[PDB]
Task: inverse folding
RNA sequence: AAAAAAA
RNA sequence: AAAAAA
């Protein structure tokens, strides 16, 4: 629980600033002799408890004042959950060298155009090693949801470190590039002192299915459908876009992208040769309303029914470009991320009134996870035989699972280190051990101005769900004398006009026990009025809107 | 298109809630002027209904013809079927509410909460009652909570069967299956309309038996080395029974924890629906007293509702209990869509503690309480209704349940997808949709009704990003300002000098309207808002509410 | 697919 | 197990 000692010269301190008690805002910090290497730098996403904010970030208040001690930032892949906070760490220090694959940095480039940022790009590949001051980094292909992921090895005077990333052990991925358990196992034979292991699906047993399976079940599904077909998947997942495109043209339709993420992500994936699609099969969103329904497949956006994603708008007709018939077939080619049920289950239900057949994961095999199930994780622990393990990229139920997996491999119980954000692992003399914790908290991004939206701002943003009633009196500067009748507004409270009318009376009465008591102070007459209006809505409604007084002096 | 006069002698069914969604179930049958209402419950608030506490059916169609209501009849005691009973009997204390022994003992406590006593009629299976122009026979249905019944309403227009909340488990622990024979004899006499459960009509096959949960628990407690904690809905006496059976079979004893549980289990016992030797019950004082391997705690909070009992011990803010990592907690429940975040939250908190958490995804510790599509097929074959109308479900669930009934022989014309407030007219044998009427969500915020609505809610949604108030004092009639603007914010920023740039921006626009010699307070407050509203957009790109106020003096 | 009920 | 974007 107390902050760690100074790091024994010659050891590694590894500490996570996000992603070890959640799923998102991944950022882990390695220090060796005062120098710092960072792996990943992604975002979270705000829930119910974080009501006004755009994005949550890792708590970079320790790198905060150490910016010249970081040698480079290394990137497993290009998820938002691993590169979202980049344009915010680099604003602080625009010349961090950011290392990552050919596709990862391409997405890091476009997200850094939104901020007037050109970064220090060092593009790597698998089997490559680059050098970074004290640190030496070796890269390994990881097949996964999005192209070109890499696992990362970190060589240092404390020993060898393996970091896996969003990793999945599919022996038949459609791109031809399986995760590289061969290589990682060779590195195991040398010695791996600590293994930073993704634990997303350590709970799920067995071995998950191959992305290769999803392709047949669309080829069949597009076959059997008489009318137009539209398919919504994620946008990082271009293996599956290619699968849909294959199945599409194969049967004679023509593909058509719909949505800003989709249109732009496929653009880059073709420019880099990750997609491959003749222009004869690509048409624009216009022609979908042109050509007979049976001759077009729409690849759209918003598998979480986020309220203005392409497919969410289409389920309301409010997507002026195209409106959905009942001969349409929507196939939710994705997973239902926890916390987005009301959105997506509402959207399917909205689609059901319209009368269009919808196929989701529960009915078919249209989606396959992006992470190793607990039995593909059993391969890694056996091929790498790590000397200590530190579960990562998941919540506590997922890290606890993964610990048991690793222990069940023979990794001793001491060498398992459940290291929640801000708690640090120290690797000196080849032993790994928990050093100490530091407070790690959430940094919000509400629009354009930083630092100013806090636990207070949010607390009252949750208050305001019951609305507010406002009182407003004016006064002659020194007197208590009101100069005008009080003025009660309210928003988010009731929609009866007369709702506040018993309250304008009770204030008027209060407002003159004030006058008949020579309360000259604006603040005190603001308080007493505020209390009369609280205690009224209290007794009368037992609702608790925020009661906001305002006392102007003239 | 509204519905015309029910040509005399016919029967008109209209759902006033329960058919667009899952919840607030209330179905209204009209026959010759008089009305029968089947069920009356609540939909729990969601993420598009911010401050409300309970969504009720739109009884705005029936608040006038209250004295035409012959009786309110109850399939079982789910809050999705008896929640809004006091919000109905406050309008008419003397409505006769008809239900089974258990089903009525819950309307008891629910309405006690509200200073109400209702006029009861306690019925059982295979037994008729008459209610004015309606006669009602009751058939036992097997379901998650005890003593549910399906309902048949014979009237001069034909004969209707209402399933309620049906499931066809063939080995219920209580030992009293759903009365599918009965329903098939009633089928041989010919039913003209079936109101069929639609909840799980999308899942193929025949769901599992409550009889399977028993063993899984008996294993889990036998294998556990410390204390055990099981969470299930307080309605499910049968589940709480095989939890209890298991514990005492293993020299353990039991302690309940939670308003719902402790209440509903004492009642279950008083009415002999749960049988437990006083010898085998202890209290939470004696719970933490004894050895862990002696106890089994039966708790609330399977949905991780924030103030629940488990969700308290997950956070260590519980008096008389604290969860060690030697504990085994069992979420003997499902995960209603919409409470993932909440349940996982509690599962994670429990994980950081170190105690094993067996959910329904790693063992057979829960079974659904609504028939799967293969079970429903035993019903369309057993009843053979001439017309089918699906109920108790969402829209993807209705299209499913409608498809089942076509595949089973009912003509497409005879399968009637009648939404909330949409009417269906059985007029001498034939069934058809006779139009619709607007129907909505009666919200219950605090102590009033009809008070909150669409635009109130839409405001509470905007206020997730705060408001900014700009306040102008003016000399009456002139439009001439008398102080400088007074900006405030509240859920916008903690930068105390955040609005300062904007006072100088609204002064210039007050100074721009005085030259306009525009003196209207409405219009000046329009201008003092669009200014400060597009300074927040420009400078901050945040989108709070803008509340102008212009007090003239 | 029904809630829950103030450390 | 990641977003959506006129
Ligand atoms: Zn990730
Ligand atoms: Zn990933
Ligand atoms: Zn129900
Ligand atoms: Zn039920």
Result:
């Amino acid at each position: 629980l107390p902050p760690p000692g100074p790091l024994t010269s010659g050891g590694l301190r590894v500490t996570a600033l996000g992603g070890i008690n959640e799923i998102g805002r991944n950022m882990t910090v390695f220090e060796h002799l005062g120098r710092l290497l960072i792996i990943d730098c992604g975002v979270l996403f705000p829930g119910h408890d974080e009501p006004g904010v755009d994005l949550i970030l890792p708590d970079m208040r320790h790198v905060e004042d150490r910016l010249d001690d970081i040698e480079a930032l290394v990137l497993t892949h290009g998820h938002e959950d691993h590169i979202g906070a980049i344009p915010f760490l680099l604003k602080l220090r625009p010349d961090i060298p950011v290392v990552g694959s050919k596709f990862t940095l391409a997405l890091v480039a476009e997200k850094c155009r939104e901020y007037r940022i050109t970064p220090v790009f060092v593009e790597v590949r698998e089997g490559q090693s680059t050098r970074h001051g004290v640190f030496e980094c070796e890269y390994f292909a990881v097949n996964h949801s999005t192209p070109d992921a890499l696992a990362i090895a970190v060589y240092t005077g404390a020993g060898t470190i393996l970091h896996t990333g969003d990793i999945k052990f599919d022996q038949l991925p459609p791109d031809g590039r399986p995760t590289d358990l061969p290589g990682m196992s060779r590195l195991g034979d040398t010695g791996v002192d600590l293994l930073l292991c993704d634990s997303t699906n350590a709970e799920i047993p067995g071995v998950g299915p191959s992305e290769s399976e999803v392709g047949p079940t669309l080829h069949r599904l597009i076959r059997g459908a008489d009318g137009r077909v539209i398919v919504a998947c994620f946008a990082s997942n271009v293996d599956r876009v290619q699968q849909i495109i294959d199945a599409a043209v194969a049967l004679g339709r023509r593909v058509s992208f719909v949505g800003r993420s989709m249109v732009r992500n496929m653009r880059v994936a073709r420019q880099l040769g990750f997609l491959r699609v003749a222009d004869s099969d690509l048409i624009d969103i216009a022609a979908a309303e042109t050509m007979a329904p049976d001759q077009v497949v729409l690849i759209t956006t918003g598998t979480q029914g986020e309220p203005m994603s392409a497919l969410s708008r289409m389920s309301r007709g409010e997507h002026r470009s195209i409106t959905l018939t009942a001969g349409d077939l929507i196939v939710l080619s994705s997973s239902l991320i926890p916390g987005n049920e009301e959105a997506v289950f509402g959207v399917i239900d909205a689609l059901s009134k319209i009368g269009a057949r919808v196929v989701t994961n529960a009915q078919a095999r249209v989606h396959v996870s992006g992470h190793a199930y607990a039995g593909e994780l059993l391969f890694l622990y056996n091929g790498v035989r790590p000397r200590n393990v530190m579960p990562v990229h998941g919540t506590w139920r997922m890290l606890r699972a993964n610990a048991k997996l690793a222990a069940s491999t023979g990794v001793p119980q001491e060498s398992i280190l459940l290291a929640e954000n801000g708690v640090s692992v120290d690797l000196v003399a080849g032993k790994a051990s928990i050093s100490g914790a530091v407070p790690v908290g959430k940094m919000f991004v509400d629009g354009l101005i930083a630092g100013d939206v806090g636990d207070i701002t949010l607390g009252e943003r949750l208050i305001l769900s019951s609305g507010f009633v406002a009182v407003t009196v004016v006064v002659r500067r020194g007197t208590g004398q009101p100069l005008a009748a009080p003025h009660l507004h309210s928003r988010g409270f009731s929609e009866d006009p007369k709702a506040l009318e018993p309250a304008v009376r009770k204030v008027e009465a209060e407002l003159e026990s004030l006058v008949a008591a020579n309360v000259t102070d604006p603040i005190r007459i603001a308080q007493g009025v505020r209390r009369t209006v609280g205690k009224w809505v209290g007794e009368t409604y037992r609702r608790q809107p925020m009661i906001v007084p305002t006392v102007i002096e003239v």
About this structure: The radius of gyration of chain B is 29 Å. Chain B touches chain A through 64 residues (CB under 8 Å).
